[PDB]
Amino acid sequence: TYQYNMNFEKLGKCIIINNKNFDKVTGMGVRNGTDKDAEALFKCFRSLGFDVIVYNDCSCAKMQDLLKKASEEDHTNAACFACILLSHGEENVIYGKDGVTPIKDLTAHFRGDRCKTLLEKPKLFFIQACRGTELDDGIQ
Amino acid sequence: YKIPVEADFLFAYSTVPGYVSMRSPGRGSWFVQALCSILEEHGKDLEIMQILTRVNDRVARHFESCSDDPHFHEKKQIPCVVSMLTKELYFSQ
């Protein structure tokens, strides 16, 4: 009664969005190393029991639509949902290959009133992306 | 009866607001390396906040940058967990 109920037929969906290449208008460089991330995350979450799906070099529209449709699927038999974003970003924002889209709008699809079959279930979002330009020099 | 529409989200950011996030072209991003490493060993037996706290620690202590640009030399990183979870989360049973 203090833990999320995990007794479902499946653990749930895991969506990985792996953005390596960007339109040069965006000013963004190639994210070398990200394929190794996506491979490691894939193997890892598959091992946990997730149904893993990997998407590559998505436009902002593709990311919005991809997540919208996932939120419209039937998660009744899933314990939870996970999404992993690998890309460029700035504060509150993440890059598609053709520009930026708010993190708020990607995750809003899974709100309780917009994704009833994930109601009372954990919705996890893992985000590898910059959130600004500040550097941490560290101490000691 | 009712539940907040924003309830039961968890965001695991690779870094804190306003800050940069590091990536090794040869090895992958710091956050993902650490996340996968801890999940492989403890994904099945630790609660999600315990996992991400350990991710926080590993990124914070095991990583420091090298660059020929001194502006980007010997820099550090700390991840950032945002939880609206209402229960403890285990990936088993």
Binding site: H88, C130 | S14, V20, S21, M22, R23, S65, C66, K75
Partner: peptide
Amino acid sequence: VEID
């Protein structure tokens, strides 16, 4: 190292 590189920047995201």
